[PDB]
Amino acid sequence: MNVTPLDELQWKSPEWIQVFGLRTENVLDYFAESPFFDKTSNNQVIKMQRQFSQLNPARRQILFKYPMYMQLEEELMKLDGTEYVLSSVREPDFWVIRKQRRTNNSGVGSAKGPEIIPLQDYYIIGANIYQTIFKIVQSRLMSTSYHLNSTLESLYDLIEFQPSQGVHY
Amino acid sequence: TMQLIKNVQDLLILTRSIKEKWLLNQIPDEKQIEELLDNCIETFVAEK
Numbered sequence: 730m731n732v733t734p735l736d737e738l739q740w741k742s743p744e745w746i747q748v749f750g751l752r753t754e755n756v757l758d759y760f761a762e763s764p765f766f767d768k769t770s771n772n773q774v775i776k777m778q779r780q781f782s783q784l785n786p787a788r789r790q791i792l793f794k795y796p797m798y799m800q801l802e803e804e805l806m807k808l809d810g811t812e813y814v815l816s817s818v819r820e821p822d823f824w825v826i827r828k829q830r831r832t833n834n835s836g837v838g839s840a841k842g843p844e845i846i847p848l849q850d851y852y853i854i855g856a857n858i859y860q861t862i863f864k865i866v867q868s869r870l871m872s873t874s875y876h877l878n879s880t881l882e883s884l885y886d887l888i889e890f891q892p893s894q895g896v897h898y
Numbered sequence: 899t900m901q902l903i904k905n906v907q908d909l910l911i912l913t914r915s916i917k918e919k920w921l922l923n924q925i926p927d928e929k930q931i932e933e934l935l936d937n938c939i940e941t942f943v944a945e946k
Contacts, residue, residue, distance in 0.1 A: 890915060892910065892911060
């Protein structure tokens, strides 16, 4: 069953931006309803935990700028696994998240902190979301080769040979 | 494709050149007349 690749997949939510608008405060809230947000990530678990509790270079800059991002670490350091964190922000139109997974290897002999490993690239441009360059290059080259093949077969069709002259047109 | 066609065509042109070289380069009674002219001249003299 034909599936559109998620790298080119682009979601638009006019109702959400009309109701709430685009801001770093609710950029994760905007991302929550997208298909790219896995329901198995610990961010959703933290979300239900918060809901239950209520019912009952630029990395350091964005680190020190917002306190909710602080709360994100102090709620995310306890849970290791696939997590969604912000990468960088330039207002009022550009935001990009950092898709990384954490394995808090607390074993004896490792003086390093929890291991952070990239998984995917996500770019929020306007109200749209974008998600390999190797594929782009090979696709461009192969389409170029197809066009070249068509041109060369047409040119060879145009070619006419005679023994007494050689090849002419 | 290009190489096969070019080689065959070159061979054919070579054969024709050989044939052309073959074609080009290979370098390799009186008395009766007396009476004939005598009769001719006397006939003209009579007829002139």
